Amino acid sequence: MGLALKKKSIPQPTNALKSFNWSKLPENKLEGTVWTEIDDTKVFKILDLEDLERTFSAYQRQQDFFVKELSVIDGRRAQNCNILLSRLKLSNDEIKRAILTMDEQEDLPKDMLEQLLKFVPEKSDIDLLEEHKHELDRMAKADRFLFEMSRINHYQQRLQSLYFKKKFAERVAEVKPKVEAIRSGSEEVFRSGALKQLLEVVLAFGNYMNKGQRGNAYGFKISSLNKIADTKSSIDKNITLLHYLITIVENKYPSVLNLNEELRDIPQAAKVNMTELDKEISTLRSGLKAVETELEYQKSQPPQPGDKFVSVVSQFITVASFSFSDVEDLLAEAKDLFTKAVKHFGEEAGKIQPDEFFGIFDQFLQAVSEAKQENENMRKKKEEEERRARMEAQLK
Amino acid sequence: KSIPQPTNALKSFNWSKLPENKLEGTVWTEIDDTKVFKILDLEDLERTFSAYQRQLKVKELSVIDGRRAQNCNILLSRLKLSNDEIKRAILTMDEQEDLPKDMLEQLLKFVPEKSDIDLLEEHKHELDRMAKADRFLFEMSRINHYQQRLQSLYFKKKFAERVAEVKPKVEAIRSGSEEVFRSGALKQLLEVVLAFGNYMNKGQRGNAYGFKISSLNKIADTKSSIDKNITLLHYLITIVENKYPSVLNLNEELRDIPQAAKVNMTELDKEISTLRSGLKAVETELEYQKSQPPQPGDKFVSVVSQFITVASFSFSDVEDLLAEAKDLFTKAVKHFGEEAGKIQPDEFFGIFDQFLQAVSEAKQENENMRKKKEEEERRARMEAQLKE
C-alpha cells in the first residue's frame, strides 16, 4: 500500500522456473535503506529473459535418486529432504496417516520426528507449490513431500505436539531427580550435626591459630573448608591441618564420624546446574502450553476420519498437565529450600548455584575422605615401625 | 569472648572471615568455639603447628599457608631478583627493565593482603631467617601502595600493545561500514539479484522491493535445470559481467570486509574498558602519590605524570575513533535492513565475506568449464574426423 511502492511493469515467465529462496524485506522496513535506490525494473530492460527461462526450468530430466520432472524447491533444502526421506522409509500417505493418528502404529521414532520438524513446508513453499496441484504427478520427491504435508491441517503443530508427547516421560524423568537432589541436598546440609560440630572445632582452630587481628572470628565462608589442608604441620610437611582436625575430631567428637551419611545426597546435587535445569523446565512448560493451545484449536474443528488428535491429545494433556503441575510444585519447594540453606551458611542471596554451593562441600567431603585414609596409612606405618623398635631393642 | 591465645607463634590457617553483621540467622548463631577450647589439648596443637620449623641448626619462621608459600617460591624462582632488587624496580617503575611483563602479571597475583601484613608484623624483629615466601610478602608489604605501584607498572608496560591491537579493529569497522555503504558494485549486484528473484519464484513469493542481505548466501542453492553444477550464482556472475562490468570492481570496493568480519564488537568493548578503567586507576594512584612527601628512588610521580599525559592522549584518540566507527556501523546496518542493534560486525560483515568467497570460487569454477567447453568445441574435431 502507498504511492511510494508504485512498482509496475512485471514481466513474468511464460513457463515455470526454479525458485530462488530469499527472505523478502517488508515494504515498511524498506525506508531509508539501499532498496530506496534500487529498481529491478532497470534490469529487465537488459536481461535476456528467454535465456534465463531455459537455463532454470522448473521441469528437468529425471534427477536420479540420492519424461520430465518438476522441481521448484532449491537444491539445498531439496537434498536434505531426500536424505531425510531415505532414512525415514515411509510413503507420504503413511506419514500423513501417522501424524493424523499421533502415530498409533509407532512408525515415527523420536529421532525422525525431530528431523521432520526441521523440514516443514513454510508459507513460501505452499504458495510456490500451489501453481502445480494439477501435476503433483511426477513432481520431484522432495517437492511432492512438502506439498503433501502442507495439505495437512496445522501440520506444524500436529508434529510438534506428537514429538513433545513422545518426549515427555524422559524429560520429566530427567528433571525430578535433579530437583530432588537439590531438595535433599539443601536439607541435609541444613541439619547435619556432624557438619555443624565440624565447623565449631575448625573455628576454634582458626581462632587459636592465626591470632592477632586475624582471629576473633564468629564464622567463615564455607569455602574456607577447602583451605584447611593448605596449612601444613611443622613436624611433618605431609600431615596437613585437615589430617589433624580429623584425628582430634574423631577422638573428642565421635558423632562427626556420621558426616558422609548425613550428607549422602551432596555428591548427586553438586552436579545439578540450576540454569540448565530451569531450561528443561521451560521447555516442558512452554511445550505444554503449545499442546493445549493446539488441542483447543483442534477441538473447534469438525471431526474427520483418521484425525485422532483431540482424542489422543486430550488424554495426554490430562495425564501430562497433572504430572507437570507436580514437577513445578517440587521445583519451587527445592529452590525455596536452597536459598534457605544458602543464607544458612553465609553465602550471598542469589549469587551461588547448587553445583558450586554443594560443590564446596562435595570437594571437602573428598578432601576429608582421602586424608582420613592417609591417616590410617600413617597409623599403620607407625605401628609396624614400633613393633620393630620393641623387638629390635628386645633382641639386642 | 574468652580468648585463650597461644604462648608461641603458630602456622596461620587462611580462612575467609565472615563479618559479624552478615552472621545473623546462620549456623554460626548456634556455634560457639568456646565449647571447644574446654577440651582442646592446646599444648599439643602448638607443638604440631609451630611458626618455627626446621628446613642440627636454627629453625625457620613460616606463617603463610603451604599453598600460597609454594606458589610464591615458584614465582620467585623464575623471577631471580633479591627482594631489594624488586623493591627498587617497582620504586623506579622498572628503570633497569628487570621486570618483564609476564612476571609483572604473576607478581600481581601474589600481593601481600592485609591479613598477611598483620600476621607477619608480629615478627618484624626476626625477618632474619624467616622463610623465603614469608620474607617476600613482608618485604613488599613495607612498600607504600605496592599493589597500585605494581598495577600501574603493568598497565604502563602493557599500553602500546593494547592500544595497538585495538585501533585496527575499530578502523576495520570504520572502513568496513563505509565500504559497504558506498559500493556501487554491491548496489548494482543487489539490483540484478532482485530482478532474478522477481522473475524466478513468481506468484505471491515475488513483487519484492528488497531482501535480507543473508539471501546472498542462498543464491547458489538454486540449481540449474541444464546442469546441477551450474548454480544460480554462477549464472548471476556470468551475465552480470557482460551487462554490468562495473560490478567487476566488487572485491576492490569491499577490500576491508574480510578484515572486519573478524572483529567481535563484544570483546572489542572489553579491551576498550580495561584501557579506560586501568587508566582511571593509574591517574588515581598518581594523584595520591603526588600528595605524598618526595623520596630518594621513588620515581613514580615523575615517570607516571609523564606517562599519563602521553597515554591519556593516545587514548582520548581511541575513544573518538571508536565512537565514529560504532556510529557508521549502526548506519551501515540500517542501510541494509538489519534490525537496530541486533547484529554485530563479525556477523554483519560475515555475511558479505561469505558472499565474496562464494563469488570468487564460482567465478573460478566458471572459467574452468569456460575452458573445458572450449577444448571440446575444438577437440571433438581431432576425433570426429580422424574416424573417417
Side-chain angles (χ1 to χ4, degrees), chain B residues 176-326:
Chain B
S177 302
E178 211 160 73
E179 297 199 346
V180 161
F181 186 70
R182 296 163 112 263
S183 171
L186 183 42
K187 199 150 170 292
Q188 189 57 58
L189 193 275
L190 250 17
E191 194 165 294
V192 176
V193 187
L194 188 56
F196 273 28
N198 282 12
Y199 195 72
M200 304 255 198
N201 41 222
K202 82 172 187 189
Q204 173 185 175
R205 243 282 86 154
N207 294 305
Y209 290 62
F211 54 68
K212 294 270 302 304
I213 47 182
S214 75
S215 290
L216 288 181
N217 300 298
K218 259 185 298 175
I219 302 193
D221 290 311
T222 308
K223 297 304 185 292
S224 179
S225 64
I226 300 308
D227 185 17
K228 71 169 60 199
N229 304 299
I230 284 197
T231 202
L232 183 47
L233 225 204
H234 299 309
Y235 188 101
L236 193 261
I237 283 179
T238 300
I239 96 95
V240 78
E241 305 188 290
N242 312 187
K243 287 195 159 301
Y244 291 115
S246 77
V247 173
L248 271 324
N249 281 45
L250 194 53
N251 310 72
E252 329 177 16
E253 39 194 56
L254 300 180
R255 66 246 207 73
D256 287 329
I257 282 183
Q259 247 305 84
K262 291 174 182 173
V263 175
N264 175 46
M265 183 88 252
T266 304
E267 191 189 318
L268 187 174
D269 261 310
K270 291 175 179 182
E271 339 233 61
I272 282 292
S273 289
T274 304
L275 279 178
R276 159 181 45 264
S277 63
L279 231 205
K280 243 282 195 175
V282 174
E283 211 149 49
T284 286
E285 177 60 35
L286 173 59
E287 184 201 3
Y288 164 88
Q289 278 293 357
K290 203 180 297 182
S291 73
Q292 283 269 174
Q295 299 171 299
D298 184 6
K299 197 190 172 177
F300 191 96
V301 178
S302 173
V303 170
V304 168
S305 281
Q306 170 48 39
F307 172 67
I308 292 185
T309 288
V310 166
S312 93
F313 188 91
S314 279
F315 187 72
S316 194
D317 228 297
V318 185
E319 204 114 68
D320 283 330
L321 308 180
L322 178 44
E324 169 189 88
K326 254 166 185 163

Side-chain angles (χ1 to χ4, degrees), chain B residues 11-283:
Chain B
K11 297 296 173 72
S12 61
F13 165 37
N14 190 45
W15 50 12
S16 290
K17 286 187 303 190
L18 222 51
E20 273 266 51
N21 29 293
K22 303 182 176 180
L23 235 57
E24 255 296 59
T26 57
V27 254
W28 298 113
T29 283
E30 334 161 12
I31 297 162
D32 183 53
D33 71 315
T34 287
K35 307 189 186 169
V36 166
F37 284 120
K38 295 187 187 172
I39 42 194
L40 224 59
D41 181 331
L42 300 190
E43 202 172 305
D44 168 296
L45 184 149
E46 304 211 7
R47 166 181 64 78
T48 301
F49 295 92
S50 191
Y52 301 73
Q53 178 190 54
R54 301 178 179 182
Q55 285 168 48
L56 196 70
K57 55 187 176 181
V58 186
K59 300 177 186 181
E60 206 181 5
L61 158 72
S62 56
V63 170
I64 259 61
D65 57 302
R67 162 160 308 178
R68 297 178 53 212
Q70 203 181 60
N71 265 72
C72 266
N73 292 330
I74 281 187
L75 164 68
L76 292 190
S77 107
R78 286 202 169 79
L79 195 269
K80 309 183 65 61
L81 282 184
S82 72
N83 307 310
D84 305 89
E85 294 182 300
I86 309 185
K87 195 248 292 181
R88 205 177 297 109
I90 99 175
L91 278 177
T92 49
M93 295 287 86
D94 204 335
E95 209 175 65
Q96 264 180 43
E97 284 304 316
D98 296 297
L99 291 175
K101 45 186 65 178
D102 59 323
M103 285 297 90
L104 238 44
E105 173 177 47
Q106 278 306 292
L107 231 36
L108 283 180
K109 291 207 169 195
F110 313 134
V111 302
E113 282 199 293
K114 176 161 182 168
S115 93
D116 302 299
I117 293 188
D118 286 331
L119 259 170
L120 275 179
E121 296 312 300
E122 297 77 5
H123 301 290
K124 49 179 187 171
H125 59 293
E126 66 178 78
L127 50 195
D128 185 71
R129 202 83 231 85
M130 180 191 248
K132 203 162 305 181
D134 297 279
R135 176 83 201 204
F136 179 50
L137 302 167
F138 168 78
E139 275 311 330
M140 298 310 260
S141 83
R142 315 296 295 187
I143 299 176
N144 167 71
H145 271 49
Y146 168 72
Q147 192 281 312
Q148 21 281 207
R149 282 177 191 273
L150 232 188
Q151 259 290 321
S152 287
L153 183 53
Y154 185 52
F155 188 67
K156 196 269 201 58
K157 285 196 183 309
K158 227 169 188 296
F159 185 67
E161 321 180 3
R162 288 175 183 164
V163 63
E165 63 131 350
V166 150
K167 275 197 164 75
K169 293 203 188 73
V170 6
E171 167 68 60
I173 283 157
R174 191 224 58 132
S175 215
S177 302
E178 211 160 73
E179 297 199 346
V180 161
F181 186 70
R182 296 163 112 263
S183 171
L186 183 42
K187 199 150 170 292
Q188 189 57 58
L189 193 275
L190 250 17
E191 194 165 294
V192 176
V193 187
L194 188 56
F196 273 28
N198 282 12
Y199 195 72
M200 304 255 198
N201 41 222
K202 82 172 187 189
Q204 173 185 175
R205 243 282 86 154
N207 294 305
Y209 290 62
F211 54 68
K212 294 270 302 304
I213 47 182
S214 75
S215 290
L216 288 181
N217 300 298
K218 259 185 298 175
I219 302 193
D221 290 311
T222 308
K223 297 304 185 292
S224 179
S225 64
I226 300 308
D227 185 17
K228 71 169 60 199
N229 304 299
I230 284 197
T231 202
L232 183 47
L233 225 204
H234 299 309
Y235 188 101
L236 193 261
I237 283 179
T238 300
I239 96 95
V240 78
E241 305 188 290
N242 312 187
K243 287 195 159 301
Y244 291 115
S246 77
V247 173
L248 271 324
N249 281 45
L250 194 53
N251 310 72
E252 329 177 16
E253 39 194 56
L254 300 180
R255 66 246 207 73
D256 287 329
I257 282 183
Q259 247 305 84
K262 291 174 182 173
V263 175
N264 175 46
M265 183 88 252
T266 304
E267 191 189 318
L268 187 174
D269 261 310
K270 291 175 179 182
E271 339 233 61
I272 282 292
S273 289
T274 304
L275 279 178
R276 159 181 45 264
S277 63
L279 231 205
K280 243 282 195 175
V282 174
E283 211 149 49

Side-chain angles (χ1 to χ4, degrees), chain A residues 198-231 241, chain B residues 5 11-19 23 28 31 33 37 63-65 68 113-116 119:
Chain A
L198 202 300
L199 279 48
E200 182 157 88
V201 179
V202 168
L203 177 70
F205 281 164
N207 286 302
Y208 193 50
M209 291 265 233
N210 30 276
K211 86 148 183 56
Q213 171 194 172
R214 291 296 56 68
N216 303 318
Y218 288 109
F220 54 73
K221 301 193 50 191
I222 22 78
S223 57
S224 285
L225 271 177
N226 299 305
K227 289 186 288 175
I228 302 164
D230 291 10
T231 298
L241 185 51
Chain B
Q5 293 273 53
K11 297 296 173 72
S12 61
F13 165 37
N14 190 45
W15 50 12
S16 290
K17 286 187 303 190
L18 222 51
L23 235 57
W28 298 113
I31 297 162
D33 71 315
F37 284 120
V63 170
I64 259 61
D65 57 302
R68 297 178 53 212
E113 282 199 293
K114 176 161 182 168
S115 93
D116 302 299
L119 259 170

Side-chain angles (χ1 to χ4, degrees), chain A residues 247-393:
Chain A
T247 29
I248 87 89
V249 135
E250 306 235 312
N251 214 286
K252 283 176 169 289
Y253 282 108
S255 72
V256 157
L257 278 299
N258 325 56
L259 184 70
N260 322 78
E261 311 79 287
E262 42 198 79
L263 295 191
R264 70 185 172 200
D265 288 47
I266 279 291
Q268 285 294 166
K271 305 172 185 171
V272 186
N273 170 44
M274 193 67 240
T275 283
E276 180 189 314
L277 193 287
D278 275 320
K279 280 176 192 171
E280 297 161 77
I281 290 303
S282 220
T283 285
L284 294 170
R285 168 143 45 273
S286 64
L288 260 192
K289 239 225 189 183
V291 177
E292 287 159 11
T293 305
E294 282 113 62
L295 175 44
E296 247 178 53
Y297 171 88
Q298 283 305 316
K299 271 210 235 283
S300 74
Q301 303 286 296
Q304 288 188 292
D307 177 333
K308 296 196 267 182
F309 185 84
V310 178
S311 175
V312 177
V313 193
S314 53
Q315 155 64 12
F316 171 55
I317 274 182
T318 280
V319 207
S321 198
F322 186 73
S323 191
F324 189 63
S325 177
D326 207 341
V327 175
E328 205 153 356
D329 272 326
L330 304 169
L331 188 53
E333 176 194 357
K335 314 237 294 184
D336 190 79
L337 228 64
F338 182 53
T339 58
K340 179 186 176 198
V342 160
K343 302 163 186 287
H344 194 59
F345 279 97
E347 279 308 311
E348 183 193 304
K351 249 54 183 306
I352 178 178
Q353 271 178 33
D355 45 41
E356 181 182 356
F357 182 96
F358 295 110
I360 298 186
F361 296 92
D362 185 63
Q363 275 179 52
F364 181 65
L365 277 167
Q366 293 197 73
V368 168
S369 175
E370 94 166 44
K372 188 180 301 173
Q373 180 46 76
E374 278 179 27
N375 267 29
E376 224 274 298
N377 310 331
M378 181 163 72
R379 170 174 72 237
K380 296 219 162 187
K381 284 203 165 175
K382 279 205 176 182
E383 250 169 46
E384 310 196 69
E385 288 164 43
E386 202 183 308
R387 281 195 328 167
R388 276 182 284 201
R390 295 175 197 159
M391 312 178 134
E392 284 188 54

Side-chain angles (χ1 to χ4, degrees), chain A residues 18-19 71-79 125 129 142-143 146:
Chain A
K18 287 207 180 298
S19 57
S71 188
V72 165
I73 268 44
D74 56 290
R76 196 197 293 184
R77 295 178 39 167
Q79 169 135 55
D125 316 321
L129 286 172
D143 295 83
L146 301 199

